[PDB]
Ligand binder design. Structure first.
Ligand code: CDL
Ligand code: CDL
Ligand code: PLX
Ligand code: PLX
Ligand code: PEE
Lengths: 459, 57
């Protein structure tokens, strides 16, 4: 695994020893090459895992997340090139350093054979994101947003640490392989109930769970474009990955303890999809859509059936790509209009036709149009839920209908109708933005050809 | 025929020829508790290192 970690570390001295006007080119080229190298982790086994060493191991759940993490950095650099133009070389190098450190921590987090090492890196990712949000955000609310994004996380994560060390004091190890092979049932006890809660709540808060989702709209709205991209694409999936790893020690207590979270997610997906219908801000609408999709992923993980896990993996990958694309489109509009109010700039199809095509395809993938991987994950989760209980179909279908409604509402409001007359600074789309949009969308339509790459270890 | 002792004589430490036996346990002490095992051996490196969390050394 060092053949990916070491180049990502070398990205830092290369960035800091670069010319003042070569940082973006060098960073983009070498991050793309690192993505290409990481692409060879996809050759997974039907047996246990790719156990590289005592410290790092790869799995067909970890490999798609690793590849998406490596692929996201070049897109983040391309998106950040525009709004950082008027800023000094040292500060741009610091921004690229924060992005590189975030990638390094995420890469080490997804392999992380140890649960304490996983926790340490899973919490180390917090610092670069907070600095990016509270340093290079625009509005005055960013500081407040950062505070939320901080404390919520720690409010969930501090009990987990205690639980973790407690387990190693009883089991003797926190290695995931030993934990899986030596797993034992949890008796229905108050102590075991609180151990279950301490294990679950940390990952629940970062999905986020419906009741615990307040930090996400603030953090995603006030963050710069690279921050929003990394928050929606990779950082939300840490909770799902952690739950998928940790639910192996929580059986059979998950059967009883899953009910409040299942109800919260099943009702909150409807609530947040309905919230999307009445939203005056593009970024907030995209954030609430992310909350709905992650609610579906929470349901899938809580059901803990093979089809549930496959659907959850597919949906995590598809949502990451789609939400990053949607945020990039919103930012392309914002850098022209500087308002971030959906109703202000209207009828952009007549002025930006190719960008309108990008908007249409992004809305189509968000709408879960078959045979996209978005719908593959959606349908697998829905079928698993139907087997779990036939009444889930009402909530699932209502969520599908509202999702289509708000996706097409977002498309029609911004692209169709009549152009706003007083806005005359809508310049033609740059090659950088179109390239960014294509680099988001072609991986999705190309992954629909080989779904088993993103269906997880239970395929 | 008594001669008075000189200066520094009555303060001398002298020896006594006595046939009384020497008390073997004048303090009436109990038996002293057994000492700790005092283990000994030849040092070897710690098995699998420190074994602290995720550290392999
Ligand atoms: C149907 C068979 C097609 C065979 C031909 C091969 C086509 C290959 C396309 C590959 C993907 C396109 C890339 C996306 C970005 C578009 C690039 C662009 O800007 O165009 C510039 C170019 C130049 O135009 P321009 O004048 O310069 O620009 C003016 C404006 O842009 C205005 O431009 P516009 O108004 O013309 O709009 C652009 C156009 C293009 O933009 C798009 O919207 C394309 C993306 C639509 C998909 C949305 C996501 C949903 C998930 C679907 C996943 C399918 C992928 C399959 C694997 C693909 C491998 C990568 O959008 C549409 O026309 C709407 C079409 C709605 C289609 C919905 C039906 C989806 C399911 C169909 C069946 C798929 C499975 C079949 C299974 C059974 C049979 C085997 O225009 C084009 O070339 C049009 C692109 C071709 C139309 C695509 C419609 C169907 C293709 C589906 C994907 C491949 C199917 C594989 C099955 C083969 C058998
Ligand atoms: C930051 C890094 C800056 C550069 C530092 C270079 C070495 C980095 C080592 C860091 C870990 C030290 C350690 O305890 O290793 C034992 C151990 C690795 O020892 P090993 O598995 O026997 O070594 C495998 C090598 O393939 C076996 O290697 P070998 O015995 O062939 O060693 C040859 C030597 C080659 O020497 C050179 O190349 C010198 C020129 C460079 O190694 C290297 O220099 C290349 C590495 O590391 C761990 O147990 C896991 C450590 C996990 C991280 C520490 C916990 C906190 C994580 C986040 C910390 C955040 C810090 C604040 C930000
Ligand atoms: C502009 C108008 C159109 C002009 C162009 C017309 C031509 C259109 C033809 C192309 C689309 C039509 C679909 C037909 C597909 C043909 C090729 C397909 O069959 O091959 C696929 C093969 O392709 C791969 O399966 C999918 C590609 C994998 C995508 C990887 C992503 C690239 C990395 C980018 C970074 C990652 C970002 C996302 C992180 C998750 C599936 O083959 P498969 O039967 O299965 O086995 C392969 C052969 N074997 C038997 C020897 C093994
Ligand atoms: C706010 C946004 C979302 C945040 C997260 C919300 C999710 C947290 C929900 C917690 C999951 C369930 C907690 C406890 C479940 C135990 C089962 C219980 O509900 O049923 C009865 C439990 O009975 C009563 O509940 C006893 C406890 C009564 C006191 C609880 C307070 C009630 C409301 C508190 C809710 C506040 C939550 C937030 C706190 C800050 C059955 O009684 P009994 O079969 O005999 O005993 C079963 C347990 N045994 C077997 C281990 C002995
Ligand atoms: C987003 C903000 C959420 C804040 C945190 C939410 C998670 C809360 C989970 C509980 C926190 C601490 C739990 C302890 C960690 C696990 C350790 C464990 O399981 O050991 C138990 C110990 O169990 C406890 O001590 C639990 C005591 C909890 C005290 C703190 C209560 C916090 C609030 C309680 C009400 C809310 C609970 C769920 C809230 C969910 C989040 C909203 C049994 O060990 P022993 O006692 O040694 O063996 C039994 C024989 N003696």
């Amino acid at each position: 695994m060092l053949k990916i970690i070491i180049p990502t570390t070398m990205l830092l001295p290369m960035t800091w020893m670069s010319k003042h006007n070569m940082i973006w080119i060098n960073a983009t080229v070498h991050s793309l090459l690192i993505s290409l190298i990481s692409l060879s982790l996809l050759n997974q086994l039907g047996e246990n895992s790719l156990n590289f060493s005592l410290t790092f191991f790869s799995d067909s759940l970890s490999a798609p997340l690793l590849v998406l993490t490596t692929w996201l950095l070049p897109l983040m650099l391309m998106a950040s090139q525009s709004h950082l133009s008027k800023e000094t070389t040292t500060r741009k190098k610091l921004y690229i350093t924060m992005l590189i450190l975030l990638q390094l921590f995420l890469i080490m987090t997804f392999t992380a054979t140890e649960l304490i090492l996983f926790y340490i890196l899973f919490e180390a990712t917090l610092v670069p994101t907070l600095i990016i949000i509270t340093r290079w955000g625009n509005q005055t609310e960013r500081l407040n947003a950062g505070l939320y994004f901080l404390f919520y996380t720690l409010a969930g994560s501090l009990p987990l640490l205690v639980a973790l060390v407690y387990i190693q004091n009883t089991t003797g190890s926190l290695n995931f392989l030993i934990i899986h092979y030596w797993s034992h049932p949890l008796s229905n006890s108050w102590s075991n109930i609180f151990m279950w809660l301490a294990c679950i709540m940390a990952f629940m808060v970062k999905m986020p769970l419906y009741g615990l989702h307040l930090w996400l709209p603030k953090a995603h709205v006030e963050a710069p474009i690279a921050g929003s991209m990394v928050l929606a694409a990779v950082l939300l999936k840490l909770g799902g990955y952690g739950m998928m790893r940790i639910t192996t020690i929580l059986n059979p207590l998950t059967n009883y303890m899953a009910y409040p979270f299942l109800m919260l997610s099943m009702w909150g997906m409807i609530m947040t999809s309905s919230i999307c219908l009445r939203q005056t801000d593009l970024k907030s609408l995209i954030a609430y859509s992310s909350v709905s999709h992650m609610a579906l992923v929470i349901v899938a993980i809580m059901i803990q059936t093979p089809w549930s896990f496959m659907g959850a993996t597919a949906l995590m990958i598809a949502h990451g790509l789609t939400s990053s694309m949607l945020f990039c489109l919103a930012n392309t509009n914002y850098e022209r209009v500087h308002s971030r109010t959906m109703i202000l700039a209207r009828g952009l199809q007549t002025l930006l036709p190719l960008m309108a095509t990008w908007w249409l395809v992004a809305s189509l993938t968000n709408l879960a149009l078959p045979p996209s991987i978005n719908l593959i994950g959606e349908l697998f989760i829905i079928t698993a839920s139907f087997s779990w209980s036939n009444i889930t179909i009402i909530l699932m279908g209502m969520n599908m209908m509202i999702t289509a409604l708000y996706s097409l509402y977002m498309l029609i409001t911004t692209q169709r109708g009549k152009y706003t007359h007083h806005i005359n600074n809508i310049k033609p789309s740059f090659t950088r933005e179109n390239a960014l949009m294509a680099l988001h969308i072609l991986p999705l339509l190309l992954l629909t050809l080989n779904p088993k790459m993103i269906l997880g270890p239970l395929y | 025929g008594w001669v008075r002792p000189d200066l520094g004589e009555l303060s001398k430490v002298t020896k006594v020829k006595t046939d009384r036996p020497l008390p073997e346990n004048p303090y009436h002490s109990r038996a002293r508790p057994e000492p700790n095992p005092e283990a000994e051996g030849d040092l070897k490196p710690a098995k699998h290192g420190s074994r602290l969390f995720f550290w392999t050394m």
